[PDB]
Amino acid sequence: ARKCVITGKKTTAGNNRSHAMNASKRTWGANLQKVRILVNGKPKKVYVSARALKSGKVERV
Amino acid sequence: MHVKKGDKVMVISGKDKGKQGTILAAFPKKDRVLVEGVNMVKKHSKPTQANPQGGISNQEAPIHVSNVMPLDPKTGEVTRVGYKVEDGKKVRVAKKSGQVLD
Amino acid sequence: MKANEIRDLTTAEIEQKVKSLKEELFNLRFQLATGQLENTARIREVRKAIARMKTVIREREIAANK
Amino acid sequence: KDPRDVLKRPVITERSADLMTEKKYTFEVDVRANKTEVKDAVESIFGVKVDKVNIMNYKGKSKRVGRYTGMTSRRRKAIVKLTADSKEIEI
RNA sequence: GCGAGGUGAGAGGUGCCCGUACCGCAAACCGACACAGGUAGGCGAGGAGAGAAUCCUAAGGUGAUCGAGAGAACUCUCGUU
RNA sequence: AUGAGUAGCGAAAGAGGGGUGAGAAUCCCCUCCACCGAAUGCCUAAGGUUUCCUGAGGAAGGCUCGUCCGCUCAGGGUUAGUCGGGACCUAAGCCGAGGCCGAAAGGCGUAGGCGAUGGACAACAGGUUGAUAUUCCUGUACCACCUCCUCACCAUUUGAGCA
RNA sequence: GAGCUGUAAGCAAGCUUUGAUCCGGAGAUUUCCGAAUGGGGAAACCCACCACUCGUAAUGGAGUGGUAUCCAUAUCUGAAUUCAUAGGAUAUGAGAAGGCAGACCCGGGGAACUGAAACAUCUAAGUACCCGGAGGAAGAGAAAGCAAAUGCGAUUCCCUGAGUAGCGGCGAGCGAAACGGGAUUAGCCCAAACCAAGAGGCUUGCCUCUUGGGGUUGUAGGACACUCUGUACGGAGUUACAAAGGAACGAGGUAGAUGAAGAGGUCUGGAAAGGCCCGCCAUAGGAGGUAACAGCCCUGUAGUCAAAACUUCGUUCUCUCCUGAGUGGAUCCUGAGUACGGCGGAACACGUGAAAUUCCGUCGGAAUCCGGGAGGACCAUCUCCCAAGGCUAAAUACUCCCUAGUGACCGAUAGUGAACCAGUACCGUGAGGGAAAGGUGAAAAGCACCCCGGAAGGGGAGUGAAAGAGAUCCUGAAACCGUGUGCC
Numbered sequence A: 001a002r003k004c005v006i007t008g009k010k011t012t013a014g015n016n017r018s019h020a021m022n023a024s025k026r027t028w029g030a031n032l033q034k035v036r037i038l039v040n041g042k043p044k045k046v047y048v049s050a051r052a053l054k055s056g057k058v059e060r061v
Numbered sequence B: 001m002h003v004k005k006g007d008k009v010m011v012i013s014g015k016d017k018g019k020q021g022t023i024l025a026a027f028p029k030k031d032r033v034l035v036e037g038v039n040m041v042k043k044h045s046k047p048t049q050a051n052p053q054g055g056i057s058n059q060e061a062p063i064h065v066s067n068v069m070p071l072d073p074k075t076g077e078v079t080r081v082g083y084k085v086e087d088g089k090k091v092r093v094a095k096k097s098g099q100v101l102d
Numbered sequence C: 001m002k003a004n005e006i007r008d009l010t011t012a013e014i015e016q017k018v019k020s021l022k023e024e025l026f027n028l029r030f031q032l033a034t035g036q037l038e039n040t041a042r043i044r045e046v047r048k049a050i051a052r053m054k055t056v057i058r059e060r061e062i063a064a065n066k
Numbered sequence D: 001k002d003p004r005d006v007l008k009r010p011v012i013t014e015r016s017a018d019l020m021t022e023k024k025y026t027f028e029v030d031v032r033a034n035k036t037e038v039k040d041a042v043e044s045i046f047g048v049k050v051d052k053v054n055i056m057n058y059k060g061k062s063k064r065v066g067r068y069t070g071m072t073s074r075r076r077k078a079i080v081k082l083t084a085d086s087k088e089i090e091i
Numbered sequence E: 001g002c003g004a005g006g007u008g009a010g011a012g013g014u015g016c017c018c019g020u021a022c023c024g025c026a027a028a029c030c031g032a033c034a035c036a037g038g039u040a041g042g043c044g045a046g047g048a049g050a051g052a053a054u055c056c057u058a059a060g061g062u063g064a065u066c067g068a069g070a071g072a073a074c075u076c077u078c079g080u081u
Numbered sequence F: 001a002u003g004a005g006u007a008g009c010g011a012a013a014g015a016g017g018g019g020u021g022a023g024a025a026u027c028c029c030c031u032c033c034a035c036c037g038a039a040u041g042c043c044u045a046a047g048g049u050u051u052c053c054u055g056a057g058g059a060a061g062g063c064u065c066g067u068c069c070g071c072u073c074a075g076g077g078u079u080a081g082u083c084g085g086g087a088c089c090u091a092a093g094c095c096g097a098g099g100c101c102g103a104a105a106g107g108c109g110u111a112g113g114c115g116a117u118g119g120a121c122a123a124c125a126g127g128u129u130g131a132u133a134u135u136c137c138u139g140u141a142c143c144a145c146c147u148c149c150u151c152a153c154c155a156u157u158u159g160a161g162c163a
Numbered sequence G: 001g002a003g004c005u006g007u008a009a010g011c012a013a014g015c016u017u018u019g020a021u022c023c024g025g026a027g028a029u030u031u032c033c034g035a036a037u038g039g040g041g042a043a044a045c046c047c048a049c050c051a052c053u054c055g056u057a058a059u060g061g062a063g064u065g066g067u068a069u070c071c072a073u074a075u076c077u078g079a080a081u082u083c084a085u086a087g088g089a090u091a092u093g094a095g096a097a098g099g100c101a102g103a104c105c106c107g108g109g110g111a112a113c114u115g116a117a118a119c120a121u122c123u124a125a126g127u128a129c130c131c132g133g134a135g136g137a138a139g140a141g142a143a144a145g146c147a148a149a150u151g152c153g154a155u156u157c158c159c160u161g162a163g164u165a166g167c168g169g170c171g172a173g174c175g176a177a178a179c180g181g182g183a184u185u186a187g188c189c190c191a192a193a194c195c196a197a198g199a200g201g202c203u204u205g206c207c208u209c210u211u212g213g214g215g216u217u218g219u220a221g222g223a224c225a226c227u228c229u230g231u232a233c234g235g236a237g238u239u240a241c242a243a244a245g246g247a248a249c250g251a252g253g254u255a256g257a258u259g260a261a262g263a264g265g266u267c268u269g270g271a272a273a274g275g276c277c278c279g280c281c282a283u284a285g286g287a288g289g290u291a292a293c294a295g296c297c298c299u300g301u302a303g304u305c306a307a308a309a310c311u312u313c314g315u316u317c318u319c320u321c322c323u324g325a326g327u328g329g330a331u332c333c334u335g336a337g338u339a340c341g342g343c344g345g346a347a348c349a350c351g352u353g354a355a356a357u358u359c360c361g362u363c364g365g366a367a368u369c370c371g372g373g374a375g376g377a378c379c380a381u382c383u384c385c386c387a388a389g390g391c392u393a394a395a396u397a398c399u400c401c402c403u404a405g406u407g408a409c410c411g412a413u414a415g416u417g418a419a420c421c422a423g424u425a426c427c428g429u430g431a432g433g434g435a436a437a438g439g440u441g442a443a444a445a446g447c448a449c450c451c452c453g454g455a456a457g458g459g460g461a462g463u464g465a466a467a468g469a470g471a472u473c474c475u476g477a478a479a480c481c482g483u484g485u486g487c488c
């Protein structure tokens, strides 16, 4: 799924709000990005959120 | 039951109240017994393969076990029943006198 | 055959008795079908004898593997 | 498995009696026995020589006793033909 | 590729499980019914005939699960004026 | 209950003579007549699931009756190497190891499978029961496989043969 | 401890004091389907491979065991590609799978009818429902807390605060918390500084990772220095604070045992347990049954006992584990893409509002002890705490089930849909919907025999207290259907 393998950031639900305050359901996506990282010490390319990449601890291969 | 096949009991209730007789058969599931000479019924039997003539038979009918009491060996009066261990074997004792029945 | 007697035999001896009882049961079922069997009570007794013997055989197998 | 688990009981009917003149014996057999098993069992048990075994399955019959209704057990009937030069079965 | 034993013929032998009854243009299936309905496919004879049309018949099947009278009005289905 | 002993009793040719029986327009047999006959015949699906055959019964069911029945009660009846299906093949479609995708549940999909309505595939004639028949019996065949055997031929490391 | 072979009559054949049937504990067996798992499949069926075994000359046949996927562990190989890695093979696994108790719990998603007398903000409602994770409980929890006192001292739940403060097309409505009174109580463990060991990058006297020690807090604590002290004398513990194991004993659960006192006399009656006249027992006058209503007839009850085996709890012992005080303010440590902020939403009783506090997506982004957070915008002062790590029992919620019981609960149109062979019959392609139907008698003593009839059904005769109790068999109302006739 569109869930960050490292931080777990995934889609979350909430409301959209019009000016008249009408509420309708919507989701917030994680900013997931295809990157090569170590998965069990074996470099696989998986989806990681930009935020998890921001640090730099998540090293690309 | 407090009585068993073979015991001489007195009938304490019913038309045959006061009559003594031997238990010919016990029916523990129904709490009824068969007492010699008590509760005679007239069965209207049809001719069958076993009995070709049929006829109206006189026959003992079971009575409820709570309508009979065993007799005391000493006095010959009715007694309630108790139990004691004797030689590593439980036996019925006549509560009135104390003596063993069987 | 009560269980105590069954246990005194060896496994080889018991399985033979099973075969003998199977012969008895087989003949009894044939007699019943033809209406030539009087003592119907024998069938159930033989079945329980076979069960009894199989129970003792299996008991020994279990004590062996343990 | 033992031969005597395969054969259940003989079938004793006008039809089976007729077949016993042609040296064919009708048996009820275990519902899982194939006709090869039937052939082997008859030889072992009765000490005869089997020419061929024909076999058929019978459905349960619908049956009623008062308000209660149910099915009879399904059966498997084997007709065992002996060879011309074989000993007959004794029953 | 596999391979020291092979190929062909004859003789002998082995060949398991499931279905198999009966209805199936029907009183047995689908229509609540022993219901003027519906139900794929194979065979489907003779005379006249182009013909599986039509009429009368063969093989074969069937006489239809309320009847006996009467022969009014009227209704339905027909015939002639 | 009333409507009411009213509507209806669901397309159609029956008649008589015997029989059975407590009882017969209605069941059985006989005779003649009548109807279908590109079907109202024969076979065989899907489906039903014992309704099939024999004997007995007449409560209920059967639009009447009933001695009768596809009904009730007892028994009995379905036989395959060759027919149809599986130990053969695949179509549409379905499922799907890993895999791809998706808030979750799940969706999609590769290899590989399943899946006839199709492809492949060896038995015919006659006889026989109240009830089964390319199945049982008689006769004469065929297909695959196996070798305690027999014969013929070939070949034993470019060595027949299998594939 | 004397009969038994179920309902369930019947016939048949048998078993049992050499102890059956029956009751309880622990075992064995446990076809096929089902997560179903050797493969397939239209659940309960079909077809295989590998070892071993039965059988045949052999084929064909049979029995037992193994053979799903994923995950974990070990071993062997290792592509494109050189080393490698992916991948593949073998072995090892009481690893997972599925179900449910229609309940309770925590989350992911999440309505509409309806209310507002219309309706969109709002309400219904974070409800119904779907999904995931679970546990016997779950969640929360050992102060970056509540407060504003000569303060309190984890969390949870009950009372109260209070329908208050507030929120709100300030409409309909929504609606706290703290203090106070209670139930229950319980506290702990890491990360970092530092020490020791070991290893790889040599980044080259530095660094990272890995082990053990050390250490856990706020008018500061710890490291580090100083002393004092223990190293088990003594303390704790498998419910947190490390983690398994074994005994002895006690009290229970899962069958049972024993257990007082009237056939008292007499009266009706088919039958006394009732009436009348007398007794007696009672730690037992609960209850059911027995031919009408029984403390003294039966099973029982009060009371006192009982366990080969299995199981629950408790207490001791064994066993296991374990130092904690004071003085320093040189230096060092005290949880970073974190706290927090903008933007977009959500949760807080609180609808963006003056909006503190908490959570999510996206982007930006601190201080780090001379430090940091909160006290409802925000600043200053003061007061109280020390976040960005984890664990933690009890009080609480619920009941499908087990045991024992209770009811100014129902009594067959009631009470469960279901007192009865009911989730059945029947209806539906299916999901699904869904009934009707209790009573002979004390005892079958269930009407021998005779008469009419083919039978059904009757009339006698018998049984019974009663057959006007004869199988839809207690009582038997009204509608409705008849027969006879006093008046018209």
Ligand SMILES: [K+]
Pocket (backbone or CB within 6 Å): B013, B066, B067, G290, G297
């Ligand atoms: K009594």
Ligand SMILES: [K+]
Pocket (backbone or CB within 6 Å): none
């Ligand atoms: K023609």
Ligand SMILES: [K+]
Pocket (backbone or CB within 6 Å): none
């Ligand atoms: K009633």
Ligand SMILES: [Mg+2]
Pocket (backbone or CB within 6 Å): D055, D056
């Ligand atoms: Mg067959």
Ligand SMILES: [Mg+2]
Pocket (backbone or CB within 6 Å): none
């Ligand atoms: Mg046929």
Ligand SMILES: [Mg+2]
Pocket (backbone or CB within 6 Å): none
């Ligand atoms: Mg004219």
Ligand SMILES: [Mg+2]
Pocket (backbone or CB within 6 Å): F006
């Ligand atoms: Mg009229």
Ligand SMILES: [Mg+2]
Pocket (backbone or CB within 6 Å): none
């Ligand atoms: Mg008609």
Ligand SMILES: [Mg+2]
Pocket (backbone or CB within 6 Å): none
């Ligand atoms: Mg017929």
Ligand SMILES: [Mg+2]
Pocket (backbone or CB within 6 Å): none
């Ligand atoms: Mg009729």
Ligand SMILES: [Mg+2]
Pocket (backbone or CB within 6 Å): F116
């Ligand atoms: Mg086909």
Ligand SMILES: [Mg+2]
Pocket (backbone or CB within 6 Å): G115, G116
């Ligand atoms: Mg409204």
Ligand SMILES: [Mg+2]
Pocket (backbone or CB within 6 Å): G259
């Ligand atoms: Mg007692």
Ligand SMILES: [Mg+2]
Pocket (backbone or CB within 6 Å): none
């Ligand atoms: Mg007593």
Ligand SMILES: [Mg+2]
Pocket (backbone or CB within 6 Å): G292
């Ligand atoms: Mg009475």
Ligand SMILES: [Mg+2]
Pocket (backbone or CB within 6 Å): none
């Ligand atoms: Mg009811």
